[PDB]
UniProtKB/Swiss-Prot annotation, chain A:
Coiled-coil positions: none
Protein name per Swiss-Prot or TrEMBL: Pre-mRNA-processing-splicing factor 8
UniProt subunit comment: Part of the U5 snRNP complex. Component of the U4/U6-U5 tri-snRNP complex composed of the U4, U6 and U5 snRNAs and at least PRPF3, PRPF4, PRPF6, PRPF8, PRPF31, SNRNP200, TXNL4A, SNRNP40, DDX23, CD2BP2, PPIH, SNU13, EFTUD2, SART1 and USP39. Component of the U5.U4atac/U6atac snRNP complexes in U12-dependent spliceosomes. Within the minor spliceosome, which acts on U12-type introns, interacts with PPIL2 and RBM48. Core component of U2-type precatalytic, catalytic and postcatalytic spliceosomal complexes. Found in a mRNA splicing-dependent exon junction complex (EJC) with SRRM1.
Localization: Nucleus; Nucleus speckle
Expression across tissues: Widely expressed.
Function in brief: Plays a role in pre-mRNA splicing as core component of precatalytic, catalytic and postcatalytic spliceosomal complexes, both of the predominant U2-type spliceosome and the minor U12-type spliceosome. Functions as a scaffold that mediates the ordered assembly of spliceosomal proteins and snRNAs. Required for the assembly of the U4/U6-U5 tri-snRNP complex, a building block of the spliceosome. Functions as a scaffold that positions spliceosomal U2, U5 and U6 snRNAs at splice sites on pre-mRNA substrates, so that splicing can occur. Interacts with both the 5' and the 3' splice site.
Entry remark concerning the domains of this protein: The MPN (JAB/Mov34) domain mediates interaction with TSSC4 and SNRNP200. Has structural similarity with deubiquitinating enzymes, but lacks the residues that would bind the catalytic metal ion. Contains a region with structural similarity to reverse transcriptase, presenting the classical thumb, fingers and palm architecture, but lacks enzyme activity, since the essential metal-binding residues are not conserved.
Swiss-Prot record, chain C:
Family classification: Belongs to the DIM1 family.
Lineage: Eukaryota, Metazoa, Chordata, Craniata, Vertebrata
Post-translational modification summary for this protein: The disulfide bond seen in structures determined by X-ray crystallography and NMR is not essential for protein folding and function.
UniProt disease annotation: Burn-McKeown syndrome: A disease characterized by choanal atresia, sensorineural deafness, cardiac defects, and typical craniofacial dysmorphism consisting of narrow palpebral fissures, coloboma of the lower eyelids, prominent nose with high nasal bridge, short philtrum, cleft lip and/or palate, and large and protruding ears. Intellectual development is normal.
Transmembrane stretches, start-end: none
Record organism: Homo sapiens
Protein name per Swiss-Prot or TrEMBL: Thioredoxin-like protein 4A
Disulfide-bonded cysteines: C37-C78
Biological processes per GO annotation: cell division; mRNA splicing, via spliceosome; RNA splicing, via transesterification reactions; spliceosomal complex assembly
The keyword Disulfide bond appears for this protein: yes
Job description of the protein: Plays a role in pre-mRNA splicing as component of the U5 snRNP and U4/U6-U5 tri-snRNP complexes that are involved in spliceosome assembly, and as component of the precatalytic spliceosome (spliceosome B complex).
Gene behind this protein: TXNL4A
From Swiss-Prot, chain F:
Gene name in the database record: PRPF6
Official protein name in the record: Pre-mRNA-processing factor 6
Region of the whole protein represented: 8 to 40 of 941
Known function: Involved in pre-mRNA splicing as component of the U4/U6-U5 tri-snRNP complex, one of the building blocks of the spliceosome. Enhances dihydrotestosterone-induced transactivation activity of AR, as well as dexamethasone-induced transactivation activity of NR3C1, but does not affect estrogen-induced transactivation.
UniProt modification remark: Phosphorylated by PRP4K during spliceosome assembly.
Tissue specificity comment: Widely expressed.
Amino acid sequence: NEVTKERTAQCFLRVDDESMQRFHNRVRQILMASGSTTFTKIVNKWNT
Amino acid sequence: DWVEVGLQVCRQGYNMLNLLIHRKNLNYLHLDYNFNLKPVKTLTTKERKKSRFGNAFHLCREVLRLTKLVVDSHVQYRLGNVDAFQLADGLQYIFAH
Amino acid sequence: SYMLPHLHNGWQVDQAILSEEDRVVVIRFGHDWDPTCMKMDEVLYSIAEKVKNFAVIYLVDITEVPDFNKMYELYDPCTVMFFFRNKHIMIDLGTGNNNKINWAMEDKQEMVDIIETVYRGARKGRGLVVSPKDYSTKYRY
Amino acid sequence: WRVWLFFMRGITPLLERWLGNLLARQFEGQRVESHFD
Amino acid sequence: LWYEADKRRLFPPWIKPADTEPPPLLVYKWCQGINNLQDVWETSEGEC
Amino acid sequence: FLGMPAPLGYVPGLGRGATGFTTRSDIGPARDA
RNA sequence: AAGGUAAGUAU
């Protein structure tokens, strides 16, 4: 609380299911479109 | 006698597996009398590929190996090498392992 | 399947392999009714005209022509085999069987690439050609 | 012993059909979506 | 258009993203604004 | 040629210099001497 | 159990 400068609430964070599914699909399309592709490109996409 | 029939079936299964092994006139795979399949020499990679058998053949080999183990235990009992209690314990060990 | 030329006996297959001197003969051993064979034959029909310059595609019914079943091990539902100047050409597909393609391929570009690689290697005199795609895995994700 | 016999009764048809179609004179050997069209 | 709409106050603060708070910082500021409201965490009289 | 009967007494394997191949021993009929 | 066959000329 900006007025009392005291502990008043508590916020718990969590990754939404949609974000997890989006990341999983991104990794899937990285992996499946990696037939005739260098290892460095695949690792770069995964790292990014 | 059941021991005689067991010996006959072990020999006949060995003959059948031997016939299956030399199917394409390839003589660089040897099947012993304990039903272990091993090359007669350091076989080349092409010959290693040419001497492949599916899981069914090895399953048949291993079941005939189990029958050979049982019949050999009974033969050992009949000769006098092992006691009747020893034969029972050996059969129990065979079927537990 | 019903559009590609058909060979009706072993002698016709012999002549088809012998006749072509500058093109790779692509022969599909199988049955018209086999679903795997229908997929392979429709892909072949799709790319039949595009590879006219450097490939000829024939279809052989193994039940009608069992003449090459023993030697070529034509026992899979579908089989695609390449010949050049009367010489069977092997492909390092990564499947463990370099002598033939024994599955249906979906993409029509991959078959064109395989035929092109076979033509290049065979015209260079090779008897084995390494395929541009490794088929040890279907790349399913 | 009985457990392996119960395995045996089930595995006998597989080995029988694999053999009889192997040492015989005559040997015998993504389609869902590419089906109806 | 964006330069003019930022020169003037065309877009009120509640329109996001506002180029000043990344979406995680947007969540943080939103939670702080929730916690800073007058007696927000009170249910003595049934307010909800 | 296409639509031509096979000549009598002709082995499809012979007359072409064909050579078979075996990927394993579990496929194909047993070799006959 | 495999996905681990260099290919090529010569008898």
